[PDB]
Structure formats: C-alpha cells, structure tokens
Paper text:
For the levan utilisation system, the cell surface components are Bt1760 (a GH32 endo-levanase), Bt1761 (a surface glycan-binding protein; SGBP), Bt1762 (SusD) and Bt1763 (SusC)15,19,24. SusC proteins are unique among TBDTs in that they are tightly associated with a SusD substrate-binding lipoprotein15–17. Recently, we showed that SusCD complexes mediate substrate uptake via a “pedal bin” mechanism. The SusC transporter forms the barrel of the bin, while SusD sits on top of the barrel, opening and closing like a lid to facilitate substrate binding.
Next, we obtained a structure without a substrate using a protein preparation that did not suffer from proteolysis. While there is no density supporting this notion, it is also possible that the plug has been ejected from some of the Bt1763 barrels in the crystal. Consistent with the relatively high solvent content of the crystals (~63%), there are large spaces underneath the barrels that could contain ejected and mobile plug domains. The very similar crystal structures of Bt1762-63 in the absence and presence of FOS appear at odds with the dynamics proposed in the pedal bin transport model, but are likely explained by the fact that crystallisation selects for compact, stable states.
Author numbering:
A (entry chain B): 224 to 1016
B (entry chain A), D (entry chain A): 1 to 553
C (entry chain B): 472 to 570
C-alpha cells in the first residue's frame, strides 16, 4: 500500500495558485483560459486578496466534460497483493541424490490493470558411479512468467494532470482535457488501453557436469551450461478521442518476439595436499562463454473489431512494418589459484586470470589479473597464550585486480544503419534516410540510405580496477563480541563510458571510450554482541558503520569540460567526487526593490524572485557566479540488526541509515514554481500555496509567476537538500511451534512469521520530498505487510 | 579458443570501412536530403518558425505564457539564457544535417568521373545542402563554426573554432559552397528534390545579400554596405539564369502554399515532405506540429500579429499605409486591403484555408488561450482539414512542401541590391517590386466572392514608374517584403540584416502591448539580441575554443 | 532484383490434467478392478512473422527487418482447442478362466 | 468443466452471424469489386483473352504446342474435353465473383434507406457486378445457372439448374440486373471504380444486343433477330444518356491502352488494377501474365494473327480490302494501312509500345517459338518496359486498367442495332461508324513519323453518306468491329452472336494454315463449338440437375 505521496493541488488550490501567479504579475486573473472566475480586490495596504472563486459546472461550452476534483494518484493505485507457495522435496541415498521444487508467485501490482505471475520448477540430481572416483550430475530449472507491465511514467503523469479534469465524461466515456488544459491524456484511460498488453516469458537454465577424482587429492571437472529464454507479446493500440486528445482512429497491433540463448562450458583441475602443518591447494581452469540474442516483430494498422481475439496481423487492413535484429558476444577465460597455510597461523593465496572478450579488437582482447591475499592468525601464536578474553584475532591483507567489460557489443565499430524511418518517434526526430527526391509526394517506396549511429574505436580496451584492502576481524569473551575492521582502496583505470560527441561533429558522434581514473577508499567496522540471558531470552545484535570518500584523478581534457563525471560543464571535477556539481548559490528572496538594486545586477531580479550570489564580486550575476554546491558522498552509512528469541517467539529488526549527505532534485520545480516547466498549466505541488507574497513575506518559496524570467531553473542550492535518513528496512516477528506439538503431525518444523518492509523513515526537517534515499521520485516505496508459514516435514 | 572470439559479426548494419564504397554513394546522397525532413522536431523546425516569434509578424501562441516559456523569453527578448535547451538543440540539429552532406562528400571525393559521370553534379548537390545549413546557422548565431572539410577526421573536430574566420570570411565560405553548386548543378532536375542551377544562383545571391550588410566591428552594428557584394547579388539574380531553369511567378499567390500545387515554377527549391511513403506515419512536416489550429484539438502555436494583419491595409489607391497603417485596426467593411492577407492569416468570420465548412470564430474553438494571443491562424503551412495530406501522429502534420526559396524572393532580393547600389537602376528595382505587387492584386482566384459574401474591398496597385530617392525606394521594398513573406520566418532576419532590428522590434513592443499583454514588459537590447547566444553547452565542450556573442559575456 | 527476409515465429503450449481412482480386490478365485477418472486438455497455438524487402547486403548477418528499405508485411494468427474426458473401467476374472 | 469447453474463440475473423452488420456493409461492397482484380489467374483471365484464342485474331503462343495444350485444343476446336481443368476453373471463378456481389446484396437488403441513403445506389452497384459475371458466363457457356437470389440459403444451391430458364429468359435475367443499375446508379461516380448510370445503360444495351440474335431452337443455330430486343439497344445507347455521364471518344485511339491515360472519357467502366497499394506485390493484372513478350524472359502468349494484321490494310482511298485483304501479306512500303494496327499488334521493325529503345525483331529475342507462332506482339495490355507500373511476381504484370466497356463499343453497338432494325436509320448507323473510323485516321499522335522513319502509308477515310443495303451495312459494321476491337477478346463472341462462327473460323483455318502450322488439322463443328461445354465436374455434382450443351452429349 502506498503510504504517502507528493501532495498536488486540488481544483480550488489550483485555482487559488493561478490567481496568485496572475496578480503577482499585474495581470487580470479573470482573463485565464481555464474557466475560473475570481472575486477579488485590494486590501487596506493595497495588496491583492482573493475573496472567492467560482467554476463552471462543465469545462467546455458544449458541456461534455464536467469540472472535477479528481485525486488522480488514488485513482490509478490500489492495494497490491502478493501470494507465494513453494513445495520442495529432496532425497538422500548412498549412491546418489535428487531434488524437486514447484513454486507459484502472483503479484497484483499496486498499479491498476497490472499483474504478474511465475510458475517455477527446479529439478536437480547426482549419481555416484565408480563409487567416489567418477560422479555425474545435473541442475535444471524451468520458469514460465506472464505480466502486464505498467506504462512508463504512469505515476508522474497522474501527478501532472490537473484535478479539474474528470475521470469520466458526461456520458460514460473516458474524460480528458478540453480547451487550454494540458495536452496530457487520461492516466486511468491509458491503463485500460494498456490492460491487454501481456507478455509470456519462458526461461530454462541448468547445467550438466562430470567430476573425475583419479587419486586422493586430484579432481578433474567439466561443466556444460545452458540458459535459454524467450519473450512473446502483442501490444494493442486502440482508438481514443477524449476531449482534445486524439488518435484519429488509429488501431494497430505489434506482435513482438525475443530470444536469448546463453551457453557455458568449463574445465577445472584441483589438487589438495596436507603434510602435518603445511596445507596446500592448486587449481587451474578455463571457461568459454557465448550469448546470442535476436528479436523481431510485426506491426499492422486498422482493425474492424477492437478486441485481442480479432487483432492479429492477418486481420489488419492498413499498412504494416516489420522490425528486428540480433547481437551476441563471447568470452574466453583462463584462471588459476594457489592456497597455502603453514600452521593454520599463516595463510597465503595467489590468483591469476586471463579474460578475453569479443567486445574488443584483437589488440586488446585479453587482460590479465592477479591477486595476493595474506593472513596471520595472531591468537594461534604462542605469545598470545596469555589473553583468554580473545578467542580470535585474524589479520588479512589483499591486493587484486578485476576487469570491467560491460559495454555495448558494437562499442568498437563505426555503425551505419539504414533507418528508413519505420519506427515511431515523438514530434519528429525519425532521422530516417528515406526522401521524396523526385517530388512524387509519396505513394511508393522512397529511395533511402544510411545514417551514423556511432563512431568506432580501434583502441578500446579493458577498464581495470586495482583493489587493496587490509582487515582485522576478531572475537572476544566466548563468541559474544564479534567484529571486523576493514580498509579498502579501489582505483579504476581506463574507465569505460559511451561518451557523446561534440555538436559540430553531428549525427552519430557518440563513441565508446576509455576515459580517466577514479579512486574510492573507505572504512568499514562491523561489531556484534550475542548472548542469552538465562531468563529465557537470546539477543544477537549486529551492527555496521562505514565511511567512504571518492575522487577523480585523471580525465581527457575534452571529457573534463564536457562534465560527464561532474562539474556541469563549468568546472573540471578532477580532484572532486564523482557526480559532484557546480551551480549558482541561492541566497534567498528579494523582499524589496531596494534589495534588487542593492544586489549585483541580474536579469530576472525582481521582488519575490530568488537572489543568486555574486561569487566573484564583479557586480553582475552571470555564468561565472557558480561554485561546488553538491557532493553525493555521505559522511557515513550505518546498519543495525536486532534478533531476539523468547518462548519460541522470534523478533527481527533491520535498520539502515545514511547521515550527512547532499541530495539534488527536480521535485522542487514541480512543488515550488508555477512555471518551472516547458509545458503550461500542469498540476503542481501544494508548497506553492505558501509561495512568497506581500501577504506572506517570510517564506523560502519564490513568488508565483507565469514566466521564469529569473532562470530559477538554474542549477542552484535551491535544489540541494539535507538527504540524511534512517529507516527500518524490515521488522518481523514469528512463532516456532514446539516439536512437542508439531511432530504430532509427523512434521518436524512449523513456523509462522509476520513481516513488514519500508514501514518507518526518519528524514531531515529541511528535506521537502517524499523519500531522501530516492530523491528524484515524488512517491515513496510502498509498505509491505506479509503473513507466512514454513511447515517442514 | 581465439577463432571463437571472432565469430560473431554485427547484424543489420554497414561498418565504417565499408560505407565509402561506390555501391552506397547515392545512398549517402539521399540520406543527406532525408535529414531535412527527418532531423527536426516540433521545437526545432527547419523553417525556423519557432524563432521568428521574435519578429513583429507573430506571437508564440499556445495555452498561455507557461507553454514553451523558453520561447516566450525569445518573443519578448527578456529571460533568454545561454543554457536553454532549444538553442542548443537547433545548433546540434543543423550540424547533424552537415554530417550527412559531408559523409557523402567524403565518398564522392573518391569516385572516378570516367566511371561515375554525375560526380561533380552530386558533389554540387551536397555543397548546396552544406550551404543551406551553414546559412541558417549564420542567420541564427552569427559566430558559427565552418565545418566544410569532409576529409577531416573525428578528432580534429575538437580544435575547430567559430572565430577561425572573420564575420565576412564566414559569409564567404558559405558563398563558396553555393558558388560550386552554380558552376556544376544542371539547368533542369527531373528529380525535383535536387536543386537546379538557378536554385544555386538564387541561394548564392541570398548569401552575398546578407554578407553585404557588414558587421565587421567587434559587435553587431552595421559597418557599411559593401558594393561588390551587392554586385554579386545582381549577377546571380539575373533573369537569364532564372529563365534557363523555368522559374517564374505563379499566376495566383495562394498556389505557393497548397498541396494541389507543389513544385510549380515559383518553387525554386523546396523540402519534399511526403505521405504514403513506407515511413511509420509519412515524411510529414512534423516540425509544424504545434502550428495547427485548436479546431484539431491542439496546439494553436505560431499566430499572426494584429500588427502584421494591419500591414496589409491599403490607401484608397492601392498602396501601403506607410505611416498610418497600424493606428486603427483593420475593418473589412471600411478599409481597402491586400489579397495576400487572406492567404497569410486566417481571420474570424472567414474560411480557414478556403473551406467554407470551417469558419473561424472568436471562440474557445479557435484560440487555445481564450483571447490572450488573439484569434488569428497561420495559413501558409496549414491545410484544408479535409486534405488527404493531413495525418495525426504525436501532432497533426502534412505533406505540404516547404519552399526554401520562392521566386518572388529572387525578384525582391534583386531589387534590394539595386536600390542599395544606387546606379540609377532604381527604376529597374521598382518594376521588379511591381512584378511581385501586380501578382498579388490578381491573386483572388480562391476568394473572388469576398466582396459579396463579406465586404472585402481589395485594392492593390503597382507603383508609378519614376525616379525615387533611395530611402523612399527601400521603404517600398521593405514593405513589399512584409506583405509577401509574412509568417515565412524571414522577417526578423531581414530586420537584423538591415541593422534596424532593435528600433522596429522595440517600437512594435510598445505598439503591440496595448493589444497583447505578453509584450507589456518586453525589451530588445541592442548589440545583443540580434542573434542567439552560442549554446553554453557548446562553448563548454570546446575547451575555450568557441567565443560567445557580443552582449552575452 | 527482389530481396527480402521473413522472420517467422511459432508457439504451441499444451497442458493436461487428470485425476484417477483405482481399486483392486482379490477373494480366492474372484479378482476385480474398478477405475474412474477425468482429464482436462487444452492447447493454445499462435504464430506471426515480419517480412521486409530490399537489402543493400545479401547476407544473413545483414538481412534483418531493421535493415530493409522496401515495403513490409506483417502476418500472424492463433487457434486452440480444449478437451474434457470422463471415463471408467471394470475388470473381473472368475478363476483365471473367465475374464 | 463445461465453461472450459467454451473459452476459446476464433482469432482474426468475423463469423457468419456478425457479418451482416451495418458496420461491414461497405466492406462487403468493396470486396465484390476486389475479386474482379484478385479472383483470376494466368490461365483464367477475366479479360477472357485465354479463350479468344479460338478467334481469327490470335494464336496461343508460348514455347510451342505443348505449352498449355488444353488451349491449343480450343484454338483449333479439336481435342477439347468436357473434363478440362481450365473450363471448370473459369466456371468456378466467375461464380465466386457472384458470391461476393450476393453476400453484399444480402446485407444491403436489410438496411434502412432513412439511415443509409446510398442503399439503392450500392444495391445497383452490386447487381451491375452480378450482371457482368452472368454475362461472361453466358458468352462462355450459353446454358448458365442464374444465381440471382441473394437470400437463398446454402442448401438450395444444390437444386439449381441451368435449364430453369429458356435461353431467352436467361438473357432477360441478366438484363434485369443492368436494368436496376440504370434506374438507380448516379450519373457521375467521383469514385471511378463504381459504374455510372451510363455504364449500366451501355451494359444493358450490350446484353439486349446479344439477346437479340435468338437461339431459341434446341441447338445453337440462329432462330431470328428479335426487333423489340434491338429497340432496347437503341434506347440505352442514346447519346443523351451517354452525354449525361461525360462519355465520349478519346481524341487519339492509343489513349485507351496507356497508363498515363486511365479513366478517360472513353473508359465507360474499367477494372482498377493498382500498384503501391499495400498488397503483396500490387493489385496488378496478373491475368495477363502469360502475354508479355519474350524480351522479359517469358512467356510470349496471346500473339496477333497474320490474318488480323492483314485486316488493317486499306484500298487506295482508305477503306477495308473487303474481299482481297488477306490475299497478300501486308507490306508497309507498298500498302496503305489503318493507324489502329500500330496500337494493336507490334510488328518487327517497329517500336514496342512507342519505345524506340526496343525495336521488335524476327528473333529468338521476340518469339519463344522460334517462328512457330510468328513474331507479333499484343500491345493493348502490355506496357513500356520502362513503365513504373510494371512489376514482376510469378509473372510480369501492370496496373493498366482493363476497360470492360469502351465508348466506341457503345457507338458500334448502336449502329449494329440500327442496321439490323432497317427503319431507314441506316445512315444514322453509318455516321456512328464514321465517328469511330474518323478518330482512327487521326490517331497518329504517337507514330506520326513512321512515314519518314519506316515508310508507313496511313490512309483511312469515312464512308460516303448515302443509302446502303443492309448486308452491305453489316459488312462495314463487322469490319469496323474488327479493326477497332482486335485482341480485346470479343471477336469470337461476335462471330457466335452473328451465327457465322463456323463459317469464318473454318475459312480462317484453311486460310491461316499456310502461314501457321498449328491450324493444319483444325476444324470447327457447327452446333457444338460455338460454346464451351459445361464442365463435367459441374454436371457431376448437380445430381442430374444440369444439362450439357448441344453437340456435347
Ligand atoms: Mg560575477
Ligand atoms: Mg510533398
Ligand atoms: Mg489502374
């Protein structure tokens, strides 16, 4: 259940706000285009005060759309309900084993006209031939999934559409905007039109292996793996005509198909050996990987009968389009490991891996990665005999490299695509290569060509991350006070990004490149305390607090002024943290004209506007009056886990926190401005009604206005907020039924649990959004209550 | 296990090392034409209609001020920010046009004339297109980057500047492209999308015309009118060139803006928007999407100004009311008026694009803003709602060709160069004005019965042929540009070319504000608002290689 | 100069369910067996394709619908059937002499 | 577990109980037009070209005798079997045309005129189409089943006969359909696929014309020419009817068979073959597939006869060589000739469909049979190989409309009724012949320079206007039919309507055999070969309800 949401204006508040923004601009508020009539005037000090307002019964002169106070968020949401059932059975026998599971999972989502279900079956087994020198086995699982996904941004568009538009027209048809109201369709009606777009997803993945043990410590193992999934769906387009919103009479169906087959193979040889004190393990291996993908669809317009039963491509009468493509990649992997321990006192492990990937040219295809890990168990040492309050004190130190390779399969190519212009696109922007070069005006295949999607890179290589951590884990008393203190230093080199191109280079200038170096070093320190009370209670309290600081070290000169990694194109983020931002500094609100003249000259400066600071003291506010105003690095992040057992009950709480952290958001452009938006008359947040006014002089929120002359949409501390938080991820209580009563039923264990996710959140007072951990959203994560059982025979 | 890492090949594409192949060269050529239809969107129309809202011809329209407020800033010249997404987009989008023109040029450079005899013709076609895009960037930004080396590798694009060339040398580099087109395009192009030699001449003249009004100062003020630049305008508007490709005035003015009448003798070069063409919804002119009237549900952008409407009045013997036109608003009953009005702006009481089944009204049905932006409609790019050329996608659009160069423009540009030369060929310049002005008075083919049905008193007359002082001549030329090219998105560029953009736009601001309240706080600042700022994001990525415009840093 | 590619897809899902109850019994000579049952059956089928003409490069790697420049056609349909089944059996043998 | 047996519903179709719904009635109407384009194939063309091979106008063509030998039997009248698949197919295919016309009629019968005012117009359209199909069946088989009850349920089709009506009553039932069309079709059809009132009149006249030559005996011999049936031909060829729909002769004869010139004033009703239309390869005239010349690789069927070529000669003052035309073969140099020849048959030495880039030659390139079937090509349904209307599927085809009724046919059918009435309106009948014959002599628009380039001596003159005896008049009318309608697949039907089919086809057999060896054993048997046998498979399935034709059992 969605607990809260950004409160948006109702039909009267929306009418009040637009009035304020009108009189704030010295404009006749009764000349609005939306049918509000305002009874107003000036007070004793000569300042606009709104006395009353009326609204038509209908929004349009033809009386097809009645005036409403719709709460759109409540209209497209509901209580989600989830139900899972899993039944498993396993069989252990001298010469083999086998396992079998059936599961079902059904989600009716919190969003109307959505749902999701997963049948699943797993079946694994092993067979001891040549008893304990030659073993054969298998794992396999099988999933069928089917779902109607919500449309993208359905929630936000429900907060965007004004409350005056009704859900239903005067007859029973879908409501919509008339006249000047926003060119945004009915979100409920969009869901209903989406309700039949259901995909069916089948996935199988398993593996078969042979394990040969030729003498005592030796092992040869080969494994073959397979992961094949396919998704199928029809996406239905139905006509609509709801006020000014219109499809004309469009109808179509797209029958989409997708395939992903992934196979894997490995061989591995391991040898273990033990001589009194010395223990040693060696291991070598290899792993080939391949994945092949393909998708394709059929689209066709115009259908006599607007039902899924009727609407197959065979039945369409309008035009058709055919889509589809494929991609793939392969991976070779050679690796080895060496473990050694002197007296369970000194550990040493070495590791070496060559990875090759078809996403790079032959000249960078493989990269080699080593590691050294070292260990000293202090308390085992002889001189540590005297400290009885110290069960363990291990000291580990590591150094290793790993690679990043997650990039496009065509990252290295200059790609020309035919792109005739057969795919939908918004408001233009087909970038089709077809043109009426003859002047015909159409009615046939046009001549066409090729356009560039990206420029290749003959020198694209692996991103390499070198990592170093030293650790101290411990336990004192009699395993009642366990803890660990770690220190890590990860540094990434030749970071991979799809990086766009300069403007003058034009179409398809995007490039996949290796670009610079980062550094991330920090401190982790977990501590625990477990102990029973001898009064019937066990507690097990496990904490964690971490800190980290991040910093960019090198960057190509072109990328640093670009601003991909931070700095907003005005300052280089080198020596700063990844994602930090430069912007203007919001210094409050001009409250008098004298305060406007008494400030560096800035264009939109007026009473009620935002005063922006003159960082360099030249007497004007321009593009240089910016500095560092946002750092995502939290000062620290913590987590505490409480576990209690008492009279067979058990109680669990998981808390996680983040303290002293900047967040940055656009939310405030919807909540704090009538006009901080490219499209007009959208619904806005309720913070507007405390906007600045002569009647309302001591407020952080600038005066409502129909025009953003002051560019208050500029990157500024107005959008930076204290995003510190602390929340209960999970609380859970359960009863375990004592075996005295449970084995009554020829059943070992029988347990009932009740659990809750995302229930509580404690935010900063000067945070004004919904959820500080996800500051971009105007809605929180919904709470989950669950009831469950774990019967066990 | 290395043969294994090479097996999978890109699917469905051509790679960079195969695309210069001869078999694809004509594909690349078509592709460069294609982006003139497919490379814009509703906020970035290659007609530049979005930015001509600065001019005294139009309002922004839409629901109100909040609807594209970034374009309300432009329309009142206050609140424009260097960071604005629309400025950055139009800059980005026209340089994408140049990419395809250059990519084809790079391949065309490698062909053998002996085995591919259309080489220089196709090369001419591509530099024409390259000129068209640089020309528009130049109108928009003044300080443009000249991207005219097609063999330049991707890394050298990082070191380009918009100050490598002086203002005059930039105009020359645009002219040099058009020059090559003139010397190499054929006289007739059966395939009418391709420009003919006369189209190149006409664009070459247009660019030497704009280059003539020098801004060789550090700012945007005029530093003279260069004689020899004008003499190139005269040379390439030569009627003997235009005759050789068959170009001429249409017998009725309306024919330039009607689907039935595409590719007539007055369409010197046009963008061939098309329908029923294999594309997802037609290569329609999606860029005009916002311009359709409210009677289609949306969106009512690009609305004519009461000023422009008034500019069509005439003076009892058929001439502009030069100093009085805008004192009183037009009254069909008592006023003489110019026929071009009824092909430019749709007024209430009169048929929308000649279809008496749709009579415009002072209605919530015809103005999204309930009177804020008035009640006038742009005809030249809309069509009969009953046209078979009209389709809906995200927005309503049509297959109506967009004429980049109308033959009237050749005639009036020729007269402008003659007036401004002052070699006693002013009379020649007035008979060219007369050619354009006479056609107007006869263009009642589609509205002949408005005297009876509505009381319109048409009267337009040619000018008496005699000696005129030059400022008087210019006054008549400017005015003929006004009534011939309204809502064709050239008005503001003229005003800037003439160096009087601050004066008349400001006067218009005070003048229009009484009728339309968005202008109540308007204000054009000289030596700043004549051009768009170069986009902050573009300056940022250059590493100090681009410089901004005067008045912007 | 025709060139085209058709990307065809077909699906057949068939599910089955039964319950069956059997009872056997032996009394010296007489042996008897009874059995009752039921079986629901369903099969759902669907196919569909995309066709497109004109390809610059005449190879499978190149020839996907995205890459075609000529006209397109879209095909596809589905059908299905269901079966219900009730049944019973009775076996009897006197002296392994009479069945 | 019975809710379970009902869940699955047909996908992608409409079921029989929903298809009579109003929302689909215009769909059914279009569907009945559609089958005239989509319901035939290469061996069953709705032009009936395949069966006009029996006539003295054409040979079968192709590789040789073995190529469609079933059509060699027809062409020589020997070896035709009642079982032949082609006869059965053409019978089956035209009754499928009637199915769609009736299915729409069944739905149209249930509409309310008050709510659907085009009801009777659409009904008229459907009975027209129903007449067209019965008419062709009647020409082909004489003893047809009259399927004109649209409310008849599927089982009653098993008890129908082709002898429920006498020969004369069958013709009347076809006329009754056309009669309703005349009384209800509009005078103009903006949508040119739909027949106009004059098209109905013209077809009504054509059917009363064929009905006039009575075969009321038990056999195919003529039993008289009925006066009142002729008087209906005169009534419905009335120029005052034809004027009201705008129909008239084209100023050049070639225009009836050129893509540039579809739906002219002489195309009274035509089949609207189309291209770039959403269908898999275009609604082209696939039925003409076999007719294209060898220069396209295949297949060289439907070749003009040396007889027909010779029929175009003229007599030093511009008239047919009535009794001498075929003695010597045409020699372009020394002979006068009729311009229609060069729009009918392509001869060697001359441009194929007016394209001097393809000159026909006595070549393996131009006759698949290396001389067996001569070297002549049918122009009227082929096109310029450079046409944009020509596409390849299984066979080469085009979007060229097939004209079912040419306005010349109205004029000549009118003259035929007048000659055969003999009310001293014979002169009227000759001035109508003259209208058609004068147009021919002026139809050199596309071949004016053949006198210079090849030495063609055009001469065609009208007839002196005076009294003519009736057999002389008929002789001139038949001849004008010959040179006007060659290779339009009406020649044999005329010959049968006139009752002289055995006489002239046999004479032609002896005459043509010296030039083409397939006729060496030919032989038409009277009172048998005038019509196709009713297909054995059709008689078989009737359970004794159909009777065969005279001479066939
Ligand atoms: Mg400053
Ligand atoms: Mg066009
Ligand atoms: Mg046609």
């Amino acid at each position: 259940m969605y607990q809260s949401k950004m409160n948006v204006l109702n039909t009267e508040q929306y009418g009040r706000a637009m009035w304020q923004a009108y009189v704030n601009d010295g404009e006749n508020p009764n000349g609005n285009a939306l049918g509000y009539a305002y009874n107003w005037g000036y007070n004793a000090d000569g300042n606009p005060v709104l006395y009353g307002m009326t609204l038509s019964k209908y929004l349009d002169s033809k009386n097809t759309m009645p005036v409403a106070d719709t709460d759109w968020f409540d209209e497209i949401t509901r209580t989600g309900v989830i139900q899972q059932y899993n039944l498993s059975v396993s069989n252990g026998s001298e010469k083999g084993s086998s396992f079998f599971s059936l599961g079902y999972y059904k989600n009716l989502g919190v969003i109307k006209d959505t749902d999701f279900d997963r049948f699943s079956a797993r079946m694994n087994s092993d067979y001891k031939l040549i008893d304990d020198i030659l073993t054969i086995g298998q794992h396999f699982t099988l999933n069928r999934t089917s779902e109607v996904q919500a449309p993208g941004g359905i929630i936000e568009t429900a907060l965007d559409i004004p409350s005056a538009i009704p859900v239903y027209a005067s007859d029973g048809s879908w409501g919509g905007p008339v006249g000047g109201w926003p060119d945004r369709r009915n979100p409920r009606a969009v869901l209903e039109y989406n309700k039949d777009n259901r995909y069916t997803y089948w996935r199988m993945f398993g593996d078969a292996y042979v394990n040969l043990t030729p003498f005592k410590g030796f092992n040869l193992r080969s494994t073959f793996g397979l992961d094949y999934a396919n998704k199928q769906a029809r996406y239905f387009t139905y006509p609509y005509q709801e006020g000014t919103q219109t499809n004309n009479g469009k109808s179509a169906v797209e029958a989409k198909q997708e395939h992903w087959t992934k196979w894997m193979w490995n061989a591995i040889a391991t040898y273990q050996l033990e001589v009194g004190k010395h223990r040693g393990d060696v291991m070598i291996g290899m792993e080939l990987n391949r994945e092949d993908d393909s998708h394709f669809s059929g689209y066709k317009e115009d259908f006599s009968i607007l039902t899924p039963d009727y609407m197959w491509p065979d039945a369409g009468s309008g035009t058709a389009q055919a889509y589809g493509a494929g991609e793939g990649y392969s991976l070779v992997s050679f690796f080895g490991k060496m473990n050694y321990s002197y007296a369970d006192r000194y550990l040493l492990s070495l590791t070496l891996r060559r990875d090759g990937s078809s996403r790079f040219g032959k000249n960078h295809r493989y990269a080699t990665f080593p590691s050294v890990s070292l260990g000293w168990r202090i308390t085992q040492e002889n001189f540590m005999k005297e400290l009885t309050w110290l069960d363990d004190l291990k000291l580990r130190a590591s150094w290793g490299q790993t690679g990043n390779q997650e990039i496009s399969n065509l990252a290295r190519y200059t790609i020309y695509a035919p792109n005739y212009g057969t795919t939908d696109s918004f408001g233009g922007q087909s970038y089709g290569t077809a043109y009426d070069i003859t002047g015909s005006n159409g009615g046939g295949v046009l001549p066409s060509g090729f356009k560039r999607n990206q420029i290749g890179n003959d020198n694209i290589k692996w991103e390499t991350t070198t990592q170093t951590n030293v650790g101290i884990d411990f336990s004192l008393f009699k395993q009642s006070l366990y803890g660990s203190l770690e220190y890590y230093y990860k540094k990434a080199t030749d970071i991979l990004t799809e990086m766009a191109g300069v403007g003058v280079l034009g179409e398809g200038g995007s490039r996949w490149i290796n670009s610079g170096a980062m550094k991330n070093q920090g401190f982790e320190f977990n501590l625990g305390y477990r102990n029973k009370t001898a009064f019937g209670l066990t507690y097990d309290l496990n904490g964690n607090i971490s800190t980290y600081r991040n910093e960019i070290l090198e960057l190509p000169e072109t990328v640093a002024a670009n601003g991909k990694f931070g700095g907003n194109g005005v300052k280089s983020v080198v020596g700063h943290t990844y994602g930090a931002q430069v912007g203007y500094i919001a210094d409050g609100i001009f409250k008098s004209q004298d305060e406007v003249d008494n400030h560096a000259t800035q264009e939109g400066a007026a009473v009620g506007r935002i005063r922006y600071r003159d960082i360099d003291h030249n007497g004007v506010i321009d593009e240089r009056d910016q500095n560092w105003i946002y750092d995502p690095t939290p000062s620290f992040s913590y987590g505490l886990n409480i576990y209690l057992e008492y009279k067979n009950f058990d109680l669990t709480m998981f808390w996680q926190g983040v303290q002293g952290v900047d967040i940055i958001s656009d939310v405030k452009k919807k909540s704090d401005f009538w006009s901080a938006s490219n499209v007009g008359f959208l619904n806005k947040g309720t913070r507007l009604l405390n906007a600045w006014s002569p009647t309302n002089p001591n407020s952080d929120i600038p005066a409502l206005t129909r025009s953003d002359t002051n560019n208050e949409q500029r990157v500024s501390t107005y959008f930076v907020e204290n995003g510190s938080f602390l929340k209960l991820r999970n609380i859970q209580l359960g009863y375990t039924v004592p075996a005295v009563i449970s084995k009554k039923m020829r059943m070992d264990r029988l347990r009932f649990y009740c659990s809750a996710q995302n229930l509580l959140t404690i935010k900063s007072k000067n945070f004004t959004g919904e959820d500080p951990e996800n500051p971009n959203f105007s809605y929180p994560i919904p709470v989950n209550i669950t009831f469950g059982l774990n019967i066990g025979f | 296990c290395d043969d294994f890492l090479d097996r999978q090949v890109p699917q469905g594409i051509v790679t960079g090392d195969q695309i210069a192949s001869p078999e694809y060269v004509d594909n690349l050529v078509i592709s460069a034409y294609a982006i003139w239809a497919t490379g814009d969107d509703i906020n970035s129309s290659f007609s530049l209609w979005n930015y001509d809202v600065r001019s005294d011809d139009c309002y922004k329209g839409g629901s109100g001020t909040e609807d594209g407020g970034v374009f309300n800033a432009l329309e009142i010249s206050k609140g424009i920010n260097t960071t604005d997404w629309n400025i950055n987009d139009i800059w980005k989008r026209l340089y994408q046009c140049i990419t395809r023109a250059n990519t084809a040029l790079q391949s065309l450079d490698q062909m053998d004339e002996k085995t591919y005899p259309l080489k220089n013709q196709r090369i001419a076609e591509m530099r024409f297109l390259r000129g068209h895009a640089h020309f528009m960037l130049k109108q928009l930004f003044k300080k443009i980057v000249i991207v005219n080396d097609e063999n330049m590798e991707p890394d050298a694009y990082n070191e380009l500047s918009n100050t490598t060339y002086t203002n005059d040398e930039q105009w020359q580099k645009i002219a040099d492209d058009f020059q090559f087109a003139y010397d190499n395009l054929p006289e007739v192009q059966i395939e009418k999308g391709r420009p003919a030699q006369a189209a190149a001449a006409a664009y070459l003249a247009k660019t030497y015309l704009y280059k003539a009004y020098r801004q060789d100062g550090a700012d945007n003020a005029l530093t003279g009118i260069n004689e020899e630049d004008l003499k190139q305008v005269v040379k390439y508007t030569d009627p003997l060139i235009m005759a050789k490709g068959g170009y001429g005035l249409e017998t009725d003015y309306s024919m330039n803006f009607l689907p039935q009448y595409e590719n007539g003798a007055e369409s010197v070069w046009a963008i061939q928007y098309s329908i029923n063409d294999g594309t997802y919804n037609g290569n329609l002119n999606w860029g005009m999407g916002l311009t359709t009237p409210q009677i289609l549900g949306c969106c009512d952008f690009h609305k004519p100004s009461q000023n422009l409407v008034n500019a069509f009045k005439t003076d009892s013997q058929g001439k502009p009311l030069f100093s009085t036109y805008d004192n009183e608003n037009y009254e069909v009953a008592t006023d003489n008026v110019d026929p071009r009005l009824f092909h430019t702006v749709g007024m209430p009481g009169f048929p929308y694009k000649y279809n008496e089944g749709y009579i415009i009204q002072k209605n919530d049905d015809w103005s999204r803003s309930k009177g804020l932006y008035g009640y006038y409609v742009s005809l030249k790019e809309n069509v009969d709602p009953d046209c078979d050329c009209l389709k809906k996608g995200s927005y309503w659009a049509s297959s109506l060709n967009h004429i980049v160069i109308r033959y009237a423009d050749v005639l009036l540009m020729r007269a402008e160069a003659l007036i401004q030369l002052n070699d006693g060929r002013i009379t020649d310049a007035i008979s060219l004005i007369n050619e354009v002005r006479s056609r107007a008075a006869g263009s009642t083919m589609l509205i002949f019965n408005y005297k009876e049905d509505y009381g319109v008193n048409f009267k337009v007359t040619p000018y008496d042929l005699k000696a005129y002082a030059q400022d008087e001549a210019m006054k008549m030329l400017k005015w003929e540009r006004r009534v011939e090219f309204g809502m064709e998105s050239s008005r503001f560029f003229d005003l800037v070319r003439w160096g009087e953009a601050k004066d008349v736009i400001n006067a218009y601001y005070v003048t229009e504000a009484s009728r339309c309240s968005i202008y109540k706080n308007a204000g054009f600042t000289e030596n700043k608002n004549e051009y768009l700022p170069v986009p902050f994001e573009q300056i940022s990525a250059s590493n100090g290689n681009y410089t901004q415009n005067f008045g912007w840093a």
